[PDB]
Design a protein around this motif. Sequence first.
Motif, PDB file in Angstrom:
ATOM      1  N   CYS A   5       0.694  -1.794  -0.184  1.00 18.72           N
ATOM      2  CA  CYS A   5      -0.034   0.133   0.259  1.00 18.72           C
ATOM      3  C   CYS A   5       0.737   1.048  -0.091  1.00 18.72           C
ATOM      4  CB  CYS A   5      -1.036  -0.002   1.210  1.00 18.72           C
ATOM      5  SG  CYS A   5      -1.999   1.252   1.641  1.00 18.72           S
ATOM      6  N   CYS A   8       0.174   3.281   3.694  1.00 13.07           N
ATOM      7  CA  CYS A   8       0.672   3.256   5.032  1.00 13.07           C
ATOM      8  C   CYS A   8       1.892   1.178   4.798  1.00 13.07           C
ATOM      9  CB  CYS A   8      -0.002   1.700   5.452  1.00 13.07           C
ATOM     10  SG  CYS A   8      -0.594   0.499   5.130  1.00 13.07           S
ATOM     11  N   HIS A  25      -4.730   0.327   0.362  1.00 12.82           N
ATOM     12  CA  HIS A  25      -5.704  -1.036   0.548  1.00 12.82           C
ATOM     13  C   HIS A  25      -6.990   0.079   0.639  1.00 12.82           C
ATOM     14  CE1 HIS A  25      -1.860  -2.221   3.658  1.00 12.82           C
ATOM     15  NE2 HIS A  25      -2.835  -3.447   3.301  1.00 12.82           N
ATOM     16  N   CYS A  28      -7.043   3.458   3.193  1.00 11.02           N
ATOM     17  CA  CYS A  28      -5.784   4.370   2.978  1.00 11.02           C
ATOM     18  C   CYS A  28      -5.958   5.053   1.808  1.00 11.02           C
ATOM     19  CB  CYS A  28      -4.834   3.228   2.802  1.00 11.02           C
ATOM     20  SG  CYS A  28      -4.376   2.556   4.298  1.00 11.02           S
TER      21      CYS A  28
HETATM   22 ZN   LIG Z   1      -2.324   0.386   3.562  1.00  7.82          ZN
END
Ligand SMILES: [Zn+2]
Length: 178
Positions: A5, A8, A25, A28
Amino acid sequence: NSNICEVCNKWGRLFCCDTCPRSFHEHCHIPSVEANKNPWSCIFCRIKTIQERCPESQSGHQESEVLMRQMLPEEQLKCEFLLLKVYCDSKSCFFASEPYYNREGSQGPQKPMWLNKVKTSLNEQMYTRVEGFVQDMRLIFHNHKEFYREDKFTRLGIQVQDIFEKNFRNIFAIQETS
Ligand SMILES: [Zn+2]
Ligand SMILES: [Zn+2]
Ligand SMILES: [Zn+2]
């Protein structure tokens, strides 16, 4: 595509951009990754297109003019991206969720603020102008500075504010000054 991702830097259930190698994600990405839409383009790509469609949008602007802009779709998008750029720093964990305040010698802020609240506010179209969003973002760090006082933990607020401010100047093409 990338296997972690973009925000993150963890693996898991990722949605992949169709026009660049980034992956995300679901929660996210900002806005949250859209249910269908094939192909799908991420917020990095959508921001690049805006620039390529109007090259002059990168000439320098005054902060005061930017803040008074109405939150039309393109300003909405830029604020979502700026928010996403803050979540991309790992130190944003300190400012993500609703804080509480109980420290000897300090009183909590009159108006608490955190990144997930600003996320929801964007999502629910509660800001009418850019100023609304930037004020809440800046209030997050200002509250932290005031509460933590001379604890060296105040530095986390300075650091994450610097990330916000550099990205604000980039995204909204603020006129460079000495
Ligand atoms: Zn993420
Ligand atoms: Zn992309
Ligand atoms: Zn044009």
